Amino acid sequence: RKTVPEFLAHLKSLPISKIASNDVLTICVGNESADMDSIASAITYSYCQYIYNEGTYSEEKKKGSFIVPIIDIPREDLSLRRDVMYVLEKLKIKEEELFFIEDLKSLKQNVSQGTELNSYLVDNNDTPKNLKNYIDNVVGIIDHHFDLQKHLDAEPRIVKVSGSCSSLVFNYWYEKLQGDREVVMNIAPLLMGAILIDTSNMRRKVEESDKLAIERCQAVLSGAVNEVSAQGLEDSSEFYKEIKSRKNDIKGFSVSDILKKDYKQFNFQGKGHKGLEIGLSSIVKRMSWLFNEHGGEADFVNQCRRFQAERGLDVLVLLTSWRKAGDSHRELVILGDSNVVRELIERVSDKLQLQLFGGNLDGGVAMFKQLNVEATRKQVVPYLEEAYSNLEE
Ligand SMILES: [Co+2]
Numbered sequence: 193r194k195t196v197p198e199f200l201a202h203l204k205s206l207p208i209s210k211i212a213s214n215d216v217l218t219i220c221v222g223n224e225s226a227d228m229d230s231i232a233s234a235i236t237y238s239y240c241q242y243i244y245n246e247g248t249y250s251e252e253k254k255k256g257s258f259i260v261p262i263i264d265i266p267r268e269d270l271s272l273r274r275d276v277m278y279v280l281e282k283l284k285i286k287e288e289e290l291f292f293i294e295d296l297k298s299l300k301q302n303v304s305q306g307t308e309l310n311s312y313l314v315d316n317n318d319t320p321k322n323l324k325n326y327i328d329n330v331v332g333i334i335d336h337h338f339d340l341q342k343h344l345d346a347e348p349r350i351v352k353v354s355g356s357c358s359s360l361v362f363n364y365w366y367e368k369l370q371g372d373r374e375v376v377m378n379i380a381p382l383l384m385g386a387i388l389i390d391t392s393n394m395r396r397k398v399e400e401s402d403k404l405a406i407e408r409c410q411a412v413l414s415g416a417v418n419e420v421s422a423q424g425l426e427d428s429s430e431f432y433k434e435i436k437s438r439k440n441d442i443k444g445f446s447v448s449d450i451l452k453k454d455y456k457q458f459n460f461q462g463k464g465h466k467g468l469e470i471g472l473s474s475i476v477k478r479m480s481w482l483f484n485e486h487g488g489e490a491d492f493v494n495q496c497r498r499f500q501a502e503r504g505l506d507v508l509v510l511l512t513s514w515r516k517a518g519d520s521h522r523e524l525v526i527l528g529d530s531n532v533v534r535e536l537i538e539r540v541s542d543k544l545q546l547q548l549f550g551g552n553l554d555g556g557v558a559m560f561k562q563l564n565v566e567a568t569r570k571q572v573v574p575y576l577e578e579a580y581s582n583l584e585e
């Protein structure tokens with residue numbers, strides 16, 4: 193019975209021909225942000241499928257090939273997620289045991305040209321745009337984002353409300369594995385890492401899925417006990433503080449690091465036949481902090497413009513969020529051509545309760561306090577998409 197790192201090291205040890213089956217190589221990939229949820233969800237899916245296929249649950253059922261879990265960033269970028277590093281360390285998962293974009297490229301390359309690369313999607317429900325020339329078919333989906341209504345024949349196809357995608361993935365596999373306690377012990381830090389970060393320690397965004405996943409982990413981690421002590425929750429709380437503090441730690445990173453470490457890119461279609469290429473970076477410190485750590489406002493904005501140019505963006509949006517003395521705060525910063533950015537912001541400013549504090553929409557760079565603190569990137573993107581649909585051309 194291989195542990196997660198043992199499973200990953202086994203995959204790394206195999207020829208691509210023993211991973212593939214009948215000229216199909218199957219992967220599981222999260223979204224382009226490569227956050228805790230995307231990483232935990234992909235590894236969990238792949239690992240649980242492996243245990244299922246090898247065990248007695250899948251008797252009279254059959255088939256099953258390996259699924260390679262993919263993290264959709266360059267290998268070097270992993271260390272920018274200090275929370276994820278901590279969680280991987282708890283399970284003794286080494287970076288050299290993981291598969292990144294470089295590895296997926298090597299897989300597409302070192303396999304036969306006639307081999308199909310099929311993907312399970314977790315933590316998104318359409319293929320990441322950067323992988324659309326690598327992935328031939330989507331074969332299953334487990335996600336908790338807005339349903340784009342693609343790949344309707346996917347098996348499974350779970351797109352449902354959840355604090356964490358990881359909860360949905362775990363509960364799906366837990367049922368198939370008949371609650372296999374060893375699997376639960378072997379994945380718990382990864383699963384709980386995602387659930388607890390995504391729900392702020394089961395205090396926000398909680399759904400039935402997350403409650404059930406947590407209940408299941410608690411039962412296993414406690415073991416046989418005559419009564420339930422406070423220790424389990426105390427341990428979860430200490431674990432949460434470690435992961436949260438590390439997610440909140442971007443000291444020592446470059447501006448480019450900060451912009452790329454929790455980043456999503458979209459192309460909006462409008463009335464015009466050329467869409468809008470837009471990138472949104474989610475950041476855990478406020479603009480004044482970022483300026484102070486990066487040589488001041490001018491230097492920081494220069495680095496943002498460089499990032500925008502490098503990624504081919506019409507518009508770059510920075511979304512900051514933080515907590516101090518119990519209260520949430522957010523900011524929204526936009527960089528782009530003055531015409532497009534003015535129109536976009538004027539159309540979302542009421543909903544997002546935006547208040548200008550720096551720059552000028554007419555200059556193409558403007559900075560806003562966002563008093564709608566409930567609106568995350570998941571909400572801001574559709575608002576901007578709708579705003580863009582109303583622009584003329
Ligand atoms: Co996110």
Ligand SMILES: [Co+2]
Nearest residue numbers: 229315356357
């Ligand atoms: Co997620």
